[PDB]
Design a protein around this ligand. Structure first.
Ligand SMILES: [Zn+2]
Lengths: 82, 135, 139, 213, 175, 25
RNA sequence: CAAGACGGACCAGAGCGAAAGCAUUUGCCAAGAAUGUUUUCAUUAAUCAAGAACGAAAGUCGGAGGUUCGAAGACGAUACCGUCGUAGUUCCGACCAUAAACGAUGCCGACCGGCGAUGCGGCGGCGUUAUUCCCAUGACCCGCCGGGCAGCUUCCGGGAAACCAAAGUCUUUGGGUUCCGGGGGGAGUAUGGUUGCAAAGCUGAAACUUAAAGGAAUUGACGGAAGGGCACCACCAGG
């Protein structure tokens, strides 16, 4: 209190804050490569997806929508981007 | 009259102690519930209406019903305490406790004690108004 | 497990040659059985096992056998907790913790303070940050 | 002017053969004077007996209501009519910071005994729980109610009253509900608190002989 | 042999444990009865033993424990052991007039009074003992004393101010 | 206690009261 | 056995709803807040005159049912109380539009101390449980974020003070906007208008009369009242 650099907050405090209440607002989500166990293709999937993303070659269910982050099925691998 | 049962074994009657807010009914009957041995209430013993629901009247009525069952052969009794229930008070008062104490002194052995006061799911209105009480 | 009037004189403590001891408090019996000295009781026979409860501090790791104390000795916080102990004749002691996370958690331990006997004991054991009735008051 | 109790007599009433205590008591009956038959007074006699008066080492809060319809000359025969729990057990079982879940079914047995089954269940506090209250959400209450309804239905619909009441003496249905509803919300002490004789078929003699051995 | 069980609610387990000594001693030395408390069923069971004295006092012993379950101190329930003309009367506050919410709480506070003072006064007026639960109220005393305490309690929940009930109950005790 | 109050009301107070009223050579 | 009633305990510093209000199970119907969102549109918004919808209880018109309770009323005692009991309390369809309908406290927006409890949603994590459950999931445990109901604490500041984290950011006085008060009575009265089957609801004076009316807390007298002590100028037993 009464002495804190509002221009340079600590990064853990910026990650702690609400996504709109940061100094420059930014999303908490990400895009990710998903590799189906029955194949080896790459699918670009939003972390907070609301639709059932299907495999382009296997036509299998990749993620299940939830209230928050999407639930990937068991057996498929994922890797974050950027 | 000595219901063909040896010495050690005993017959169980059941006693309904209706401890109302006007008197106490001590009602002894067979284990089924239909055939009743004797029913002596508080007003059969005392003379006034001040003490119909007194502990002394319940004590004397319990002595009377205990003597009546002892001249028949019933020594063991189950107990069903029972307030007036329904919309009214739902706890057996001092009359029921007096009757239990008197039946304990008389030589009667107590079986199972259970409250059988009628609790509603949720009943109609009570005899009081929006404001009224006892006193 | 039944309690008869014939057992009231029997129930004094945990009941199991020339010189003995008539010690009662667990501290002296503990140090005597640690030294191997044979301790006696109000009854004729001696003591083989002695088990009781002590207070252990989880802040500065110091134990106290005083069952009525509430503050610690070295650190001085209100931080003592019940830990059981048992000793034998051979000089062997074993002392039991509890692996229950209910005892060690800082739930009701932080609250804002106002600016500056045994009755009403269960009211203090409630945490202040909780629902009390709207028309009742804590002092 | 004359004592009525000299004309009365005594009938000895005993439980069916599955209970290790044989005699359950004595009953006062009036004698036949031609106008009415003494056996007609025993066609519907309802008895309340606790289970601790019927077994030695078992619990006491459970009680059974028995219907009596037969007599054969100083030998009285009873039949099942229902059950209940002791009022003090129910009153002590309803605690405060927990949820009470009730269910009921109307089910038919293998021999026409149409029964009404009631169940009451309470939620557990965990062995490391620090929150004062342990409430089940409404959907979880619905799954618990559906699960216990279907379990009691599948346990009594295709089953006969012998093994039904031999489940009722130790309340194995309660153990089944406690084991099966654990994956939703941990239940505390579930009981079949009431069995009601809804519908009774035509009476036959050999089956009560199998009740009494 | 006779037996009798008394349930223990969860709010009464710690008081029962803390002064258990002065609870089991006056039964085993005076009435010669044999007691225990099981934790699986949470029940205090009393049964008669061989060295029983005055068997037609077992019920009294049960009343002892029963009073301590209702919130009475062990001294008053030991008085229930000693005196024979002592009874227990229980009723709810809503059991005589429907009060909902804050009205019920204000009725409770009127029975209690500031510092419990009003309630305490009634005790010394009537030579009774009153413990009132969340909505329940229990009175321990002789019959006419119960009637006087019930009169004062019913008048306080009518809405009569505590001052008038205080003065009238002192005047009635004078008579 | 309750029984102490009942017995104190059942008995009569007594005990201390100093009432001051009223050779060699 | 039947009839109508009502859904106890669970039931809370709880939840939902615009408010009035809402608690037995299951099924159907359409709404809804919060959350999550690297979706879409691109200023579509805030407030209310006129106007419209709902609005506890009682009450009024018509149908059905009347279990309990019960205005008026009939008896008995002493405005209080008891017995009996009509309208009503209940359902359906229209009127009524009034409450201490309360936080006695407009709505939207910004800033301004702390704590940890709780309801919901999301996220992260050692770990324990479905008899060392063989990965996940429900139940707990720790921590964070968002909108909530609601507490405790504070010389933030404000206030007549009680007190308020708003009733603060007010003589250092201006974010936007609606309703509304001007000493006490006459008096929410008369009259006029309007709505209503009616009861009544909405709007609403003046003549006249008066130096007060009222708010906040604090005690101090105030006949007195409850405990004790003492006294043969008080008493018992007496002379
Ligand atoms: Zn320490």
């Amino acid at each position: 209190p009464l002495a804190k650099d509002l221009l340079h907050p600590s990064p853990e405090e910026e990650k702690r804050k609400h996504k709109k209440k940061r100094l420059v607002q930014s999303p908490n989500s990400y895009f990710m490569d998903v590799k189906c166990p029955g194949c080896y293709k790459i699918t670009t999937v939003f972390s907070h997806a609301q639709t059932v993303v299907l495999c382009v070659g296997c036509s299998t269910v990749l993620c299940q929508p939830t209230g928050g982050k999407a639930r990937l099925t068991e057996g498929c691998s994922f890797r974050r981007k950027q | 009259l000595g219901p063909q049962v040896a010495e050690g074994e005993n017959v169980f009657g059941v006693c309904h102690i209706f401890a109302s807010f006007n008197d106490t009914f001590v009602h002894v009957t067979d284990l089924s519930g239909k055939e009743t041995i004797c029913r002596v209430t508080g007003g059969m013993k005392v003379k006034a209406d001040r003490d119909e629901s007194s502990p002394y009247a319940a004590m004397l009525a319990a002595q009377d019903v205990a003597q009546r069952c002892k001249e028949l052969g019933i020594t063991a009794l189950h107990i069903k305490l029972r307030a007036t229930g329904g919309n009214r008070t739902k706890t057996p008062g001092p009359g029921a406790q007096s009757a239990l104490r008197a039946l304990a002194r008389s030589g009667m052995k107590i079986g199972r004690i259970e409250d059988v006061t009628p609790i509603p799911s949720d009943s109609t209105r009570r005899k009081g108004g929006r404001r009224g009480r006892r006193l | 497990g039944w309690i008869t009037p014939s057992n009231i004189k029997q129930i004094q403590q945990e009941l199991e040659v020339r010189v003995g001891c008539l010690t009662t408090d667990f501290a002296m019996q503990n140090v005597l059985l640690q030294m191997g000295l044979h301790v006696l009781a109000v009854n004729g026979m001696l003591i083989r096992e002695a088990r009781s409860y002590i207070l252990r501090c989880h802040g500065c790791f110091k134990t106290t056998s005083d069952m009525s104390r509430v503050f610690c000795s070295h650190c001085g916080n209100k931080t003592l907790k019940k830990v059981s102990v048992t000793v034998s004749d051979d000089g062997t002691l074993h002392m039991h913790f509890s692996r229950n996370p209910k005892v060690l958690n800082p739930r009701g331990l932080r609250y804002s303070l106002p600016t500056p006997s045994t009755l009403g004991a269960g009211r203090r054991r409630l945490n202040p940050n909780a629902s009390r009735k709207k028309f009742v008051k804590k002092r | 002017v004359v004592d009525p109790f000299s004309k009365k007599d005594w009938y000895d009433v005993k439980a069916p053969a599955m209970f290790n205590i044989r005699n359950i008591g004595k009953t006062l009956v009036t004698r036949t004077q031609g106008t009415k038959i003494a056996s007609d007074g025993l066609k519907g006699r309802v008895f309340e007996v606790s289970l601790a008066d019927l077994q030695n080492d078992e619990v006491a809060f459970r009680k059974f209501k028995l219907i009596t319809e037969d007599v054969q000359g100083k030998n009285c025969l009873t039949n099942f009519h229902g059950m209940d729990l002791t009022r003090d057990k129910m009153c002590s079982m309803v605690k405060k910071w927990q949820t009470m879940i009730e269910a009921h079914v109307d089910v038919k047995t293998t021999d026409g005994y149409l029964l009404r089954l009631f169940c009451v269940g309470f939620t557990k506090k965990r062995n490391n729980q620090i929150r004062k209250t342990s409430y089940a959400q409404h959907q979880q209450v619905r799954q618990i109610r559906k699960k216990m309804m279907e379990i009691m239905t599948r346990e009594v619909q295709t089953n006969d009253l012998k093994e039904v009441v031999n489940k009722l003496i130790p309340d194995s249905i309660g153990k089944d509900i406690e084991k099966a509803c654990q994956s939703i919300y941990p239940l505390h002490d579930v009981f079949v608190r009431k069995v009601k004789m809804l519908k009774k078929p035509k009476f036959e003699l050999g089956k009560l002989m199998e009740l009494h051995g | 042999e006779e037996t009798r069980k008394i349930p223990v609610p969860a709010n009464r387990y710690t008081p029962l444990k803390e002064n258990w000594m002065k609870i089991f001693t006056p039964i085993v030395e005076h009435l010669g009865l044999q007691i225990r408390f099981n934790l699986k069923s949470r029940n205090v069971e009393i049964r008669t033993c061989k060295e029983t004295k005055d068997v037609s006092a077992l019920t009294k012993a049960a009343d002892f424990v029963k009073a301590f379950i209702l919130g009475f101190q062990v001294e008053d329930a030991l008085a229930l052991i000693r005196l024979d003309d002592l009874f227990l009367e229980s009723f709810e506050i809503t059991d005589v007039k429907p009060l909902k919410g804050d009205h019920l709480s204000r009725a409770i506070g009127r029975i209690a009074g500031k510092g419990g003072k009003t309630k305490f006064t009634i005790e010394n007026v009537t030579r009774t003992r009153i413990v009132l639960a969340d909505v329940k109220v229990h009175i321990l005393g002789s019959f006419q004393n119960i009637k006087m305490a019930r009169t004062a309690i019913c008048n306080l929940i009518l809405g009569n101010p505590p001052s008038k009930v205080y003065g009238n109950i002192r005047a009635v005790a004078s008579r | 206690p309750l029984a102490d109050q009942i017995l104190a009301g059942n008995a009569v107070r007594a005990g201390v009261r100093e009432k001051r009223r009223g050779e060699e050579y």
